[PDB]
Paper text:
Glucose-6-phosphate isomerase (pGI) catalyzes the reversible isomerization of D-glucose-6-phosphate to D-fructose-6-phosphate in glycolysis and gluconeogenesis, and facilitates the recycling of hexose-6-phosphate in the pentose phosphate pathway. The protein has an alpha/beta fold with an extensive dimer interface. The active site, identified based on sequence and structural alignments with related proteins, is formed at the dimer interface and comprises residues Arg270, Glu355 and His386, with the active site histidine donated from the partner monomer. The catalytic mechanism is an acid-base type mechanism with Glu355 acting as a putative general base, abstracting a proton from the substrate to facilitate the reversible isomerization of the substrate molecule. Histidine 386 donates a proton, facilitating the ring opening mechanism. As expected from the high sequence identity (over 60% identical), the E. coli pGI dimer aligns extremely well with the mammalian enzyme structures used for molecular replacement.
In all, we determined 23 structures, four of them not deposited in the protein data bank. These novel structures represent enzymes involved in stress response, specifically methylglyoxal reductase (YghZ), as well as three enzymes important in core metabolic functions, phosphoglucose isomerase (pGI), 6-phospho-beta-glucosidase (BglA), and glutamate dehydrogenase (GDH). YghZ and BglA have a classic TIM barrel structure, pGI adopts an alpha/beta fold, and GDH possesses a core Rossmann fold found in many nucleotide binding proteins. Based on these experiments, we demonstrate successful structural characterization of multiple proteins using only microgram quantities of purified material.
Residue numbers in the entry:
A (entry chain A): 1 to 246, 251 to 549
B (entry chain B): 1 to 549
The structure:
């Protein structure tokens, strides 16, 4: 696929001059000029997800020039290269096919001359029939009891998605109690072990590689704990399954749910790694989750760029990331269930596009991926919005909300939504000194005596947002929402000329921690490192317990 | 206190020029030129909290110039003003005295000529008595049973502190099951109410005005569920208390105003866990431990108020942060505790830091033309490491990180802790020093491979390092050590506020959102098409009416 340096193109030069003309233009002005602005800068996916990008510092012209850049970088070809199984993960020489995982239409997708769909579909059928055995109570523990608790053990890609989605979709859950263990910090597994009974608990050891130190440390601790009660290791097979590839660990071959190298960790909840999702909400809802991503995959691969939502959001993201130079993006779902959605995308986005060497192997001199953060509304709202309204850093926000709650109480939801609508309105348009002063007059006060407070109550506004309204958070709509960002992330990586699907940047810390661990196993003064590392290691030895 | 524009000082200018000479200097060279660097760029608080700021892009000279800036801005006077009860919160005309809340020494602190310590101590003695009656099972619910569950209902400062701290200190907890509700999203309260029994559940409604919309919406949904079981509002007093000063509203709710625990307007929300607002902390870990939390904050208070600037940890961190915020222009700071129990620590400081210094008008009423508060984020190690560290090591944004870890775990388990800590050590080492292309090529050669045939990968394995960090090693996370750690950051935030010439203790930026949502709520009730706002607010509101059922 093409490896075009976006900064050296004519479209980039044109975006540069446009930015100079645009940089002080105001969102309030853009709305003042065009009364139908919302209808020109919004679109709806599948009659259920409205994406309103109208409160942005953009004109029809900005989008056109940004579309010129996507075309110059051959975005259309990159998309076709991904969906068809071309081996675009060049540093690892791999296909990138999380789209095959949810390919409900079952069109063949080839890797090394072979259709991947039959194996994709076999693992799924296996997850269905396994989940039925667990959920129905047909599958029994070692003392002949039904499973009540399922404990996922994994880190990164094997943890954030399954945790995020089972939380997001609690309204769809069955009776099984779900736990997600990931930190090597012992408190994580210890806090779980003390709540669960060895005879009714199912562990899933999730790990692309099955070598990860954290996951295997945790899996071994769970194994040990289990055996302290069960006594005999023949019982392990009723209580442990694997989500990976590697068996002497003690897991029945038949208990191994496989996935493939062309499945990135941070794009893996759709595969065998999603079993904890299947066990929590059942196989049908999992398939609904797959179906939603699929419909969004279809939208992305067949919709013309001007009406293509992943592209539009990607392009708007680039305008701020690369022309305004904002470092961050906030993701703010007005939905407590979705309290882990921002966190998931910290890996989805930052591990994909947090890169500095281009597809041609050259260090870049322009910005790559942004820093993703956020908490759900209204929680985030009462923590850190002060800075978003009145700080000195521009933070583009995505506000997300369902029209329908799963927990309707009094007027909670209308109160929740009123903030959803109000915050973006506030961010865009602000509140001038004259309005501030007029409020003080309406109280019979003379604002001239209030210079100590008045200037601090002014909101400059002009702060951009997207708003995403869905009918309701369903497995299907959530599936669609996740993939929407997956493909924004894709689109940004193609344009920024980087490799969105590898992650060599995690290596050095693992290798450095590898050298350090053995040094902790004696009572000796360490001096093989720089003076800081030495200092900290030696103080630890002096203070440890 | 003084309101000096930092950008107009000789110190600011000497820093600008120093940065022009420093901007390309690497941490590797800083460490190679002086083997004693660690010892010159680190200090320990109270024989228990080592703060290592050596892996930073700083020299002795950088620190001298940053100190010069704090002097020119009268940091010392500002500190004396806060601690003495001067009304430094000028936009609201208030004192700023969270230091009084934990002032164990009981030296008088006067506001409007009156010592605040008596009232402070009186609320604490009342929290003590109440907590003992709850914890001991002496206080019975409407059916005569001891309490088993405590649900806190609050937003922002009434939620983040209590929750963060009860989590961080779970090893010190008693038998009480704690719950924290804050979102106006009905899910939040609903998920709690389905897991608790009305006869053994105690609610804490945390809200100074006792009119806060989210909190009172939640409190009222709880009252409703409670009465649907109890059948009589006379039992409210056994199951609801208030952290508030509005006696009229509290009493009307059905709560015995004897169980109104109060605080004062010189207690900011985002500094309120040390007050009445921390009742749930007292209930979860006991009054003894809460007092240890207090004493740890007080020891840090003494440190901040009495240590020379050159060894004053909140000041040093604050200055270093300013070097990156204002001279490097980094937008963010990550707080990364290698401790699962502290998983809400970073989130806590998104408020404490960002609502504090996320400001754009200086203390003289003039709009700033320089950077103020940074954006705070983070997840506990090792989780964040497998999520976002790729961008911190290999992205194009510089992210100063504070790595934090205890040397003792409360959950010892084979070699789990040693592994945890090996990551804590290794990550800052990796970020400071990196890994050259030469080293990468040598690794292949030693495999007997020809790195010339490996162009498709070699360039991508190079770590250019020179990414700064602080490392905070504690003996152990205790109520005391945690009290001091929270206070360290509170005073870092103060120092930055002072220097940056802004108002650290107000939050006028929250008002607009609130007035616009107030206008919008009644419009959500009918089926009328809405056209009272901009086209987009209208469009979203109307789509919502089409889709809501």
């Amino acid at each position: 696929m093409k490896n075009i340096n976006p900064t050296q193109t004519a479209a980039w030069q044109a975006l540069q001059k446009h930015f100079d003309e645009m940089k002080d233009v105001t969102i309030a002005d853009l709305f003042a000029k065009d009364g139908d602005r919302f209808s020109k800068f919004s679109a709806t996916f599948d009659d259920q997800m409205l994406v309103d990008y109208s409160k942005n510092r953009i004109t029809e012209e900005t989008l056109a020039k940004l579309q010129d850049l996507a075309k110059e970088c051959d975005l259309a070809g990159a998309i076709k290269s991904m969906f068809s199984g071309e081996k675009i993960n060049r540093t690892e020489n791999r296909a990138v096919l999380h789209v095959a995982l949810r390919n409900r239409s079952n069109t063949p997708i080839l890797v090394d001359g072979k259709d991947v769909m039959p194996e994709v579909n076999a693992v799924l059928e296996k997850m269905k029939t396994f989940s039925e055995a667990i959920i129905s109570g047909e599958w029994k523990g070692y003392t002949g009891k039904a499973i009540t608790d399922v404990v996922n053990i994994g880190i990164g890609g094997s943890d954030l998605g399954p945790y995020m989605v089972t939380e997001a979709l609690r309204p769809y859950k069955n009776h099984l109690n779900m736990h997600f263990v990931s930190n090597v910090d012992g408190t994580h597994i210890a806090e779980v072990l003390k709540k669960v009974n060895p005879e009714t608990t199912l562990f899933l050891v999730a790990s692309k590689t099955f070598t990860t130190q954290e996951t295997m440390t945790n899996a071994h601790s769970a194994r040990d704990w289990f055996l302290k009660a069960a006594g005999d290791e023949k019982h392990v097979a009723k209580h442990f399954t694997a989500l990976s590839t590697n068996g002497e660990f003690g897991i029945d071959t038949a208990n191994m749910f496989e996935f493939w190298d062309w499945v990135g960790g941070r794009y893996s909840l759709w595969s065998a790694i999603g079993l904890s999702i299947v066990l929590s909400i059942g196989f049908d809802n999992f398939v609904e989750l797959l179906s939603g991503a699929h419909a969004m995959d279809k939208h992305f691969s067949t919709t013309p760029a001007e009406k293509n939502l992943p592209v539009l959001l990607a392009l708007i993201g680039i305008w701020y990331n690369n022309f305004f130079g904002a470092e961050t993006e906030a993701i703010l779902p007005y939905d407590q269930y979705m309290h882990r959605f921002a966190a998931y995308f910290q890996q989805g986005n930052m591990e994909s596009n947090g890169k500095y060497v281009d597809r041609n192997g050259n260090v870049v001199d322009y910005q790559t991926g942004p820093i993703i953060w956020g908490e759900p509304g209204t929680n985030g709202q009462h923590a850190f919005y002060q800075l978003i309204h009145q700080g000195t850093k521009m933070v583009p926000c995505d506000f997300i909300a369902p029209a329908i709650t799963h927990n309707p109480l009094s007027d909670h939801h209308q109160k929740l939504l009123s903030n959803f609508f109000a915050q973006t309105e506030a961010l865009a348009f602000g509140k001038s000194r004259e309005v501030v002063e007029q409020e003080y007059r309406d109280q019979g006060k003379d604002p001239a005596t209030l210079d100590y407070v008045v200037p601090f109550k002014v909101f400059e506004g002009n702060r951009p947002t997207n708003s995403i309204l869905l009918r309701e958070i369903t497995p299907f709509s959530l599936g669609a929402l996740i993939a929407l960002y997956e493909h924004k992330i894709f689109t940004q990586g193609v344009i920024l000329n980087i490799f969105t699907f590898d992650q060599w940047g995690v290596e050095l810390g693992k290798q450095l921690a590898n050298r350090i661990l053995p040094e902790l196993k004696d009572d000796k003064e360490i001096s093989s490192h720089d003076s800081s590392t030495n200092g900290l290691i030696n103080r630890y030895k002096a203070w440890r317990g």
